[PDB]
Design a protein around this nucleic acid. Structure first.
Ligand SMILES: [Mg+2]
Lengths: 251, 1340, 50, 50, 277
DNA sequence: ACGTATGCTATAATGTGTGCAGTCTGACGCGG
DNA sequence: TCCGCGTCAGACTCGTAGGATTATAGCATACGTG
């Protein structure tokens, strides 16, 4: 695929493929010439070297290094370990309806509450604004609703504020050790780019207000709204599963 | 004391007078690169070395050859000013003279046949600034000094390779600067092995055979000799009394007359002196004793001529009798000892399957090139090429030095190649350590970790350029015609240029300067790393490397290193630390002569530190004499204890040499845990400079030193009176004594005005001097972005109070007043640079006009006709900075768009849109715009308006240069003319253009008038070509990437205010997020009324153990107490004498204050300019370890009429009622870290998608969703929440059907689960099929 | 052992998702094994109901 | 060390007392970064089997 | 023993004939007249010569094993067409072939984006002209500076430099630290996210209701023309194929549909609001 | 006709090597 | 069957930063499409 800069970029597989096809076609040429066997031998050894390098480069011998003196990424490599498809691009995913930001204290909040910035929740609940907008008849179509949101007009804040009520949001902190590493709350819109978290559940995340960031996630489906309120709500999660002991405890 | 110091003096609580003044902190970087360019005549260093090393190069036939003559540096094409802006390397032309000499073939060596000679370019080398930076592609970048294992020899031992045996296997290893590795290692059976390049394991006698050593010679080298004489019938044996030592008498030991030891008895030191004094030489012994002993040399039967027994063969009774009757009654055998002189080479030869020299070179060849049939030359060439060729191998100076002093040798300086001697000497000391004597070296000792600065590394990379040219020279010389081919046709300039830019870009050590703070610049140039090429790796890195080693003392800082996986490897250099001439580190030390602590200083190497005993700086001098106490706490041999006076040999110079720059700025570090001290010094580097530079009330003194040496300020080259002050520049008139008699003598300092940083922050230089002020040489004339009267100003001090506040300071959370926000004091500047690129697509060229399709008149309001936003125009996310349009191809206007473009008309022509618009969310003020155009296609009208300014501004700027330079030049002539022909007004009648017309008598001053007259003309002619260079480089088309036609670079200027989410900290590692900006109504306040600025949590203190912050607070309050008293007297408008008494009483309070500043010396006018700067608060210096103690701080608090305690009666602002009990209040110098929330927060609903995984991208950089990793997944599995997970696996990530389908369902209101199956899995199916595996989805 | 007990489950998808991924697949290819999905890793991969 | 640190944080450490404090400080914070991977890897190992 | 494909072949050539002047002629004379064994020998013999020629053409594009294979094919074409009757040696004649066959095979399999010889041959002279200039200008020559010495076109020089532009692999790390490659950054062109997918779906569904809400004979010659409801995007004159069969009345009815629809966009709250877009 | 591709040259030349070498605990798999 | 030593497998989880290569002759008919 071509870069914006007029450059192109190719995967190392294409490069490894050209090694296989070149040598294979050169063998077809040498079998046409009925060349002496000593040469045919090298060609067959080469062909194998290329095929084995295509399937799993770094294994039989030296992995074929390329341009930046680094080894070419083969097929097996995209199925192999952390950096493979499994762990990196299948079990682990970057996810929509997600935002992260510096957290700060919320000593005014109740346990089932958390400060959510307005401009964060704005972008997060984008399809829910366009939906409630067509219902009121303020938007006739969706690109009309898109511009209504963009202009940040006064009456759009009040609609955003409508959908968010009675709607839980997931708050995650890295790293996710135990299940309590995510808890759900009822978002409270606050003017400011900082998330405001409940002091007592700080224990579960191990979240120190010394510059921590927490990922936000919006539960889309009604089932996810029920799951977030039933299972993942902060009030329904008190005691640790490890020990029948309260993790929600002042400090 | 100086003038700039007279304006504001810092009260110093030091009691250890500085015998050594803090050096220039950027010593290493500047001195290192200085060596690299330095064309040394003989003592090759840098480039001169690189040429003499590789050159002369000769053809593969050896009939023609290329010889190096001399090289030179041309002045830079573009200077720093220009380079920083355009965006190309600040480099100098490399012109090297080459000489092509060709010999006659049949003739001996016809050297004089064609001595061709010419000069040739190859590559442009990035130069170093005066700041110690490299401008690469318009970025001042810093190359970090590397820390690597020093070449030479090194003895190690895996204390249990096989814990099966649990045997400490000792090994030796010869580490060269260039060449192959040479290791020697034992094994469970103590057989010596050699492993070149750590390849195959080969018996260690095979390498000796290769050096032509017969079995006999080998044994004769290592083992001693035992003589056996067979006299008549009695077998006899030579005894050195000191041999049967710590062994058992296996036989009856009896002499000329006496039985000493009985059978089966230990021979003690008594029995050894018994025999040694009796002068015993010969002893009669049994023949059963030799059974086991190894014969030394060969023994042929004199009679037959056959070997009765070969060398190195265990004797027996029958072999000994065969030797007695052969006719040998003098036998030589090995002195084998299982305890001391060990038999290793002996047992090794029994394993060794080789035979002679030539066969030993075979297995050496069969190791490294296995499969190639070996010849006499191939086997010999390889081995000789390894450690014995001037080409392949080079230990270097440090290599041979460490190699020699490791073998306790004779030479410091010797040969680059390994000699036979060297190899065996190394095997010998390995075997010494194995025996018992000799200690192994440890790698963590800095005596083995050498430092390699940029200049040495630039030299190395410059060699590979020469090596890669060597290839192209030789092959072109041999087959190419001799005569025709010129030397530059065979040279290539790209391999050198590419290999050097490889270093100045891709290398781990070449990284973008962290210049978001003077401290960041200076500590990042003083960074030293063990990583990158030829070093270590997080993957490879152990613990003992990272651990602080007692060698670090005075050399490296114990508390300066990232807390990340790159923790112990990266390290800043110590304050007074410096590089050894060879490579190691060295630290200053006061020599003690005959008890007397002499002021003579000696920088002791890492090696010699261990030798002498070194007293600590805590020790008390007797004011020119010796240590006051008889006993002195000192340290040596890497340990610490008390010693007597005469036993002390050296002493720590200052008390600050243990620490680095980063740590020398922390006050009361002595009262801070090392864990929080580290974080504190790490965050002090992250301190973004504020709007108004506020000096620190609670400093160390090092403040000024940092600000000045950082090269961010502008300090005076020559002292005199500031002829002119200006915001843009400074003009100073030099005094007669300093001013040169040749030139005019008026220095020019054009101060760097607001422009961007590598971290997108402000850079300004404001004049810190008044118009027409007398200034001394080396005084700060303009302050930097984070400096104040030359002292460092990183953050701002404020009244702080430690107490909880309704949990708004919960876990280190910060509660800041609105009054801080009102003063806009922590409000920061952020200069952001955005660019607009006109490219050449397949469809056609792009341009830059105001004509943009699908736009509002509102968007094109801030643009001009050319299509660039006005200077000073406020902009916001969505507004367009620069109008761009690209070609639109065959475009399928969809029916719904063809109808919509037909209804609202506006039939847009063949053109697209890609105008550079302010990124959604940013908003600031455009401060400047710069246009780069290729040499060709005609220009924008705005690009012409900018050319107008550059030119007419340069014409003015150069007019101003020649004008003020003229005035300073005639100012001299005017003074010269008076000396001799004294006439005042009559001389000043006619104009000044006819002054060179007037002269003087035959005198030195007549020659002076001729100098100034022809130098005035020299400037008059110079002015034209100075104008030419400016004019051309403005008309010149700036060379761009292929495809690009022109570029427009915009500079915004954002003013972000502090807000909840912003991260701030002290310098004691006390972190915190601002949680709430409290109303001024709600802020606590003292009885007197002034409110508190920040309210910190007291619980962020005990657990932390960083009590330095509390002392910072107390002293800051005391310091302010004094400023508050001075503020009151200056407001009351009292008197000069009243201020004098109080201020003299303030400066003189400490026990033994270092500075004793008398104010009787200060004039009345000098006192009031001082007091005026003291009113914000008397700035105090608390040296790192020689800081102020409670006795001094509480005494200062009594001067300020502050409480001894430091706790004040506070009242709650919300209410008005008092708090239940007193709270600590004072001024803590806090900082605003770069981790600002506006640069953190992110949000996404739906946006971009990945290329193959088809899941969203990553980061707010590319607008990507947060990653939900497997750990995040298991959490929902535990909850039971199944849809919430499936929702985050499919619709929110890959599921292409799901994501769009779900979107449409949400806007409908029906939040309904509609899964399908992520693409990333559908990929995994085909990926396993591409690997030749049948993976299909078997159905129900 | 844990490392071994993970690679033992009849689910080869769960085994390859863990580690030894080069080996798991080859042993599963030669056996011609068909995984009928019981585990969580198995159904999280395919993006189905847990 | 045979000789421990006599002072406290109120009284102030001398120059070595800090140098000595370093040895323990850096190695304690080295095991915060490096040893976490063995413990975090255990979490991974345990999960897959369970 | 030996398990490197390099050293194995390099062994087998090390045990092959090393021919004399009259030997070359004896075999070659029979090789042209097809001795079978003869063509095999001359080739077997001069594999050693191919290796020394690939030793100078290495570290530039392909590996040493790839130069030898294609270098062997040059020796074979040299054997297919050698002149033994000529008194001149073979080693001389075969070198011209082995140097050519290598250069040619490198010009093809070196670049990912296949570059024919024409564009390449020329590129070299532009680059080799840059050498001369660079040494004497001490400044890497511009596209102009190369054009002024050859006296050739500006865009030619520039477009030939555009084809020299080399690639970064998508799987290449960033910042010399395995953290993220370019694929974990680079966006997908083809598929725009749900917001753009639902834009067209919602915009088109509203249009379908607008046609049913307008006159039946006004949306019958409008949607069928633009190809909105119909199957092919026709023109004013081509709408006559349906039922209209008119040119004037089709143009009046098309515009009558658009005029009533322009009032429908001014009343819904777009017109000038949706004109910016 | 234009762009791409195929083709030949004749002093003699005849066997490569190149490049990081404090990872480490734990676990098998081929000979010996 | 057991011991030694070779290969081969893992190494917590999320955020941010920026840059660049060498060279393949030279010229004349052979092969593909408006
Ligand atoms: Mg934290």
């Amino acid at each position: 695929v071509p870069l914006d800069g007029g450059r192109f970029a190719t995967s190392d597989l294409n490069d490894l493929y050209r090694r296989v096809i070149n040598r294979n076609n050169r063998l077809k040429r040498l079998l046409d010439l009925a060349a002496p066997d000593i040469i045919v031998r090298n060609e067959k050894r080469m062909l194998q070297e290329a095929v084995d390098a295509l399937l799993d480069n770094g294994r039989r011998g030296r992995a074929i290094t390329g341009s930046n003196k680094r080894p070419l990424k083969s097929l097996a490599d995209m199925i192999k370990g952390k950096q493979g498809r499994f762990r990196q691009n299948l079990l682990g995913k970057r996810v929509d309806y997600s935002g992260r930001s510096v957290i700060t204290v919320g000593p005014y909040l109740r346990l089932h509450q958390c400060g959510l910035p307005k401009k964060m929740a704005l972008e997060l609940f984008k399809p829910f604004i366009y939906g409630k907008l067509e219902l009121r008849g303020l938007a006739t179509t969706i690109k009309a609703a898109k511009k209504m949101v963009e202009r940040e007009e006064a009456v759009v804040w009040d609609i955003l504020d409508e959908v968010i009520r009675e709607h839980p949001v997931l708050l995650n902190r890295a790293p996710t050790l135990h299940r309590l590493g995510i808890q759900a709350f009822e978002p409270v819109l606050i003017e400011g780019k900082a998330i405001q978290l409940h002091p007592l559940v700080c224990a579960a995340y191990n979240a120190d207000f010394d510059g921590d960031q927490m990922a936000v996630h919006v539960p889309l489906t009604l089932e996810a709204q029920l799951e977030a309120r039933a299972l993942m709500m902060s009030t329904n999660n008190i005691l640790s599963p490890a020990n029948g002991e309260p993790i929600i405890v002042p400090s | 004391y100086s003038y700039t110091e007279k304006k504001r003096i810092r009260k110093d609580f030091g009691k250890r007078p500085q015998v050594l003044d803090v050096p220039y902190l950027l010593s290493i970087q500047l001195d290192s690169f200085q060596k690299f360019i330095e064309q040394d005549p003989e003592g090759q260093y840098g480039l001169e070395a690189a040429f003499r090393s590789v050159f002369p190069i000769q053809s593969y036939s050896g009939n023609s050859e290329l010889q190096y003559v001399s090289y030179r540096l041309g002045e830079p094409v573009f200077d720093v000013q220009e380079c920083q802006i355009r965006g190309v390397t600040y480099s100098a032309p490399l012109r090297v003279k080459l000489r092509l000499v060709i010999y006659e073939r049949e003739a001996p060596e016809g050297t004089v046949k064609d001595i061709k000679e010419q000069e040739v370019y190859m590559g442009e080398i990035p130069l170093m600034t005066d700041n110690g930076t490299f401008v690469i592609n318009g970025t001042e970048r810093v190359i970090v000094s590397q820390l690597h294992r020093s070449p030479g020899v090194f003895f190690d031992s895996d204390k249990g390779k096989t814990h099966s045996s649990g045997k400490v296997l000792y090994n030796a290893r010869i580490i060269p600067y260039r060449g192959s590795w040479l290791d020697f290692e034992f094994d469970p059976k103590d057989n010596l092995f050699v492993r070149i390049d750590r390849r195959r394991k080969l018996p260690a006698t095979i390498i000796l055979r290769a050096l032509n050593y017969t079995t006999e010679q080998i044994l004769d080298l290592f083992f001693e000799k035992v003589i056996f004489e067979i006299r008549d019938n009695k077998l006899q044996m030579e005894l050195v009394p000191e041999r049967l030592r710590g062994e058992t008498a296996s036989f009856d030991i009896e002499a000329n007359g006496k039985v000493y030891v009985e059978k089966g008895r230990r021979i003690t030191a008594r029995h050894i002196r018994q025999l040694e004094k009796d002068d015993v030489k010969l002893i009669e012994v049994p023949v059963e004793y030799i059974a086991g002993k190894v014969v030394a040399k060969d023994y042929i039967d004199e009679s037959t001529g056959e070997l009765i027994c070969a060398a190195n063969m265990e004797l027996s009774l029958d072999l000994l009798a065969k030797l007695s009757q052969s006719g040998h009654k003098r036998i030589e055998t090995l002195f084998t000892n299982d305890l001391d002189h060990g038999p290793y080479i002996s047992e090794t030869l029994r394993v060794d399957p080789t035979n002679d020299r030539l066969s030993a070179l075979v297995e050496i060849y069969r190791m490294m090139r296995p499969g190639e049939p070996p010849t006499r030359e191939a086997a010999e060439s390889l081995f000789e090429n390894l450690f014995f060729s001037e080409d392949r191998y080079d230990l270097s100076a440090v290599g041979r030095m460490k190699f020699n002093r490791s073998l306790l040798r004779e030479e410091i300086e010797g040969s680059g190649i390994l000699s036979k001697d060297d190899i065996i000497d190394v095997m010998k000391k390995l075997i010494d350590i194995r025996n018992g004597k000799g200690e192994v070296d440890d790698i963590d000792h800095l005596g083995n970790r050498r430092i390699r600065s940029v200049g040495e590394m630039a030299e190395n990379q410059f060699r590979v350029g020469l090596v890669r040219v060597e290839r192209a020279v030789k092959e072109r010389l041999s087959l190419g015609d001799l005569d025709t081919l010129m030397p530059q046709d065979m040279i290539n300039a790209k391999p050198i240029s590419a290999a050097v830019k490889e270093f100045f870009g891709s290398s781990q050590l070449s990284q973008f300067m962290d210049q978001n703070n003077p401290l960041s610049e200076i500590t990042h140039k003083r960074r030293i790393s063990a990583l990158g090429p030829g070093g270590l790796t997080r993957e490879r890195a152990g613990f003992e490397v990272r651990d602080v080693h007692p060698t670090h003392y005075g050399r490296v800082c114990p508390i300066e290193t990232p807390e990340g996986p790159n923790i112990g490897l990266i390290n800043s250099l110590s304050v007074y630390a410096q590089t050894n001439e060879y490579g190691f580190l060295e630290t200053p030390y006061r020599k003690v002569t005959d008890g007397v602590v002499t002021d003579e200083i000696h920088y002791l190497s890492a090696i010699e530190e261990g030798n002498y005993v070194i007293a600590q700086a805590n020790s008390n001098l007797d004011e020119e004499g010796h240590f006051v106490e008889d006993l002195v706490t000192c340290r040596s041999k890497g340990e610490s204890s008390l010693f007597s006076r005469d036993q002390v040999d050296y002493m720590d110079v200052s008390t600050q040499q243990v620490v680095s720059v980063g740590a020398s700025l922390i006050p009361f570090l002595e009262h801070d845990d090392a864990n929080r001290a580290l974080m504190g010094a790490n965050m002090q580097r992250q301190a973004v400079p504020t709007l108004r530079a506020d000096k620190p009330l609670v400093g160390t003194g090092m403040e000024r030193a940092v600000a000045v040496d950082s090269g961010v300020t502008a300090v005076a080259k020559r002292g005199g009176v500031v002829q002119y002050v200006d915001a843009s520049r400074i003009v100073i008139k030099v005094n007669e004594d300093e001013m040169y008699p040749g030139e005019a003598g008026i220095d020019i300092y054009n101060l760097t005005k607001y422009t961007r940083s590598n971290q997108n922050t402000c850079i300004n230089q404001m004049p810190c001097v008044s118009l027409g002020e007398p200034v001394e040489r080396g005084d700060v004339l303009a302050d930097g972005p984070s400096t104040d009267l030359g002292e460092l100003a990183l953050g701002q001090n404020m009244r702080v109070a430690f107490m909880p506040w309704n949990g708004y300071n919960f876990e280190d959370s910060i509660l800041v007043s609105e009054r801080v926000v009102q003063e806009d004091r922590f409000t920061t500047i952020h200069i952001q640079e955005l660019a607009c690129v006109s490219r050449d697509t397949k469809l056609g060229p792009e341009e830059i006009t105001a004509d943009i399709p699908n736009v509002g008149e509102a968007a094109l309001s801030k643009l001009d006709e050319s299509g660039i936003v006005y200077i000073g125009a406020e902009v916001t996310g969505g507004d367009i900075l620069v109008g761009k349009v690209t070609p639109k191809g065959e475009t399928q206007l969809t029916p719904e768009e063809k109808l919509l473009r037909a209804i609202f008309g506006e039939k847009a022509s063949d053109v697209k849109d890609s105008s550079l618009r302010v990124p959604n969310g940013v908003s600031g003020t455009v401060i400047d715009v710069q246009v780069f155009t290729r040499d060709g296609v005609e220009k924008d009208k705005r690009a012409l308006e900018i050319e107008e300014m550059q030119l007419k501004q340069a014409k003015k700027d150069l007019s101003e240069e020649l004008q003020i330079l003229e005035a300073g030049l005639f100012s001299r002539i005017r003074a010269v003319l008076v000396a001799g022909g004294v006439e005042a007004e009559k001389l000043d009648k006619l104009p000044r253009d006819r002054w060179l017309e007037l002269g003087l008598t035959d005198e030195e001053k007549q020659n002076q008038l001729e100098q100034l007259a022809e130098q005035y003309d020299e400037l008059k002619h110079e002015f034209e070509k100075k104008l030419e260079a400016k004019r051309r480089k403005i008309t010149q088309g700036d060379d761009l990437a292929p495809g690009v036609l022109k570029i427009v670079k915009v500079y915004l200027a954002v003013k972000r205010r502090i807000q909840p989410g912003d991260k701030m900290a002290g310098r004691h590692g006390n972190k915190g997020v601002i949680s709430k900006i409290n109303p001024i109504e709600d802020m606590p306040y003292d009885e007197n009324g002034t409110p508190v600025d920040i309210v910190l949590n007291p619980l962020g203190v005990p657990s932390r153990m960083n009590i330095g912050q509390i002392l910072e607070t107390h002293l800051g309050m005391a310091a302010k107490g004094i400023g508050d008293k001075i503020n009151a007297m200056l407001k009351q408008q009292q008197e000069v004498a009243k201020l004098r008494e109080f201020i003299q009483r303030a400066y003189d309070l400490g026990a033994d204050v270092r500075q004793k500043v008398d104010l009787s010396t200060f004039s009345d006018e000098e006192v009031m300019r001082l007091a005026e700067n003291l009113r914000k608060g008397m700035p105090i210096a608390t040296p790192v370890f020689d800081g102020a103690k409670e006795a001094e701080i509480k005494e200062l608090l009594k001067l300020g009429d502050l409480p001894t305690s430091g706790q004040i009666r506070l009242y709650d602002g919300r209410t008005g009622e008092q708090f239940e009990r007193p709270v600590t209040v004072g001024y803590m110098y806090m900082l605003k870290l770069n981790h600002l929330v506006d640069d953190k927060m992110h949000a996404r609903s739906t946006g971009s998608y990945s290329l193959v995984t088809q899941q969203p991208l990553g980061g707010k950089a590319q607008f990507g969703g947060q990653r939900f990793g497997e750990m995040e997944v298991w959490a929902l599995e535990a909850y039971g929440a199944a849809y919430t997970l499936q929702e985050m696996l499919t619709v929110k990530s890959d599921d292409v059907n799901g994501r769009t389908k779900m979107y449409k369902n949400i806007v409908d209101g029906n939040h309904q689960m509609e899964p399908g199956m992520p693409e990333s899995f559908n990929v995994l199916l085909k990926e396993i099929r591409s690997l030749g595996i049948n993976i299909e989805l078997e159905d129900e | 052992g844990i490392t071994k007990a993970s690679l033992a489950t009849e689910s080869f998808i769960s085994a390859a998702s863990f580690q030894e991924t080069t080996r798991v697949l080859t042993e599963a290819a030669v056996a011609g094994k068909r995984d009928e999905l019981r585990g969580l890793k198995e159904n999280v991969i395919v993006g189905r109901l847990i | 060390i045979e000789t421990p640190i006599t002072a406290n944080f109120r009284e102030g450490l001398n120059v070595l007392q800090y140098f000595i404090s370093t040895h323990g400080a850096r190695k304690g914070l080295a095991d915060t970064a490096l040893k976490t991977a063995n413990s975090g890897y255990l979490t991974r190992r345990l999960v897959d089997v369970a | 023993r030996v398990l490197d494909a390099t050293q194995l072949y390099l062994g087998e050539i090390g045990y092959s004939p090393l021919l004399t002047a009259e030997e070359e002629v004896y075999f070659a004379r029979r090789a042209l007249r097809g001795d079978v064994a003869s063509r095999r020998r001359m080739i077997e013999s001069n594999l050693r010569l191919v290796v020394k020629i690939a030793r100078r053409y290495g570290n530039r594009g392909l590996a040493l094993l790839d130069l030898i294979e294609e270098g062997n094919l040059g020796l074979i074409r040299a054997v297919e067409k050698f002149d033994p009757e000529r008194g001149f040696r073979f080693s001389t004649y075969a070198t011209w072939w082995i140097r050519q066959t290598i250069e040619r095979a490198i010009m093809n399999q070196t670049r990912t984006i296949r570059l024919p010889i024409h564009i390449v041959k020329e590129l070299n002279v532009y680059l080799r002209t840059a050498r001369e200039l660079s040494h004497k200008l001490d400044h890497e020559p511009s596209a102009e500076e190369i054009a002024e010495q050859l006296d050739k076109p500006v865009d030619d020089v520039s477009r030939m430099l555009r084809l020299n532009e080399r690639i970064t692999s998508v799987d290449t790390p960033l910042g010399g630290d395995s953290e993220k490659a370019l694929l974990d950054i680079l966006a997908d062109e083809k598929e725009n996210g749900p917001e753009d997918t639902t834009q067209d779906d919602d915009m088109k569904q509203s249009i379908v209701k607008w046609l049913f809400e307008l006159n039946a004979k006004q949306r019958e010659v409008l949607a069928r023309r633009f190809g909105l409801l119909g199957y092919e995007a026709a023109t004013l004159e081509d709408v006559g194929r349906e039922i209209g069969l008119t040119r004037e009345r089709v143009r009046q009815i098309q515009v009558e549909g658009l005029r009533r629809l322009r009032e429908i966009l001014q009343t819904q709250g777009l017109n000038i609001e949706a004109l910016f877009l």
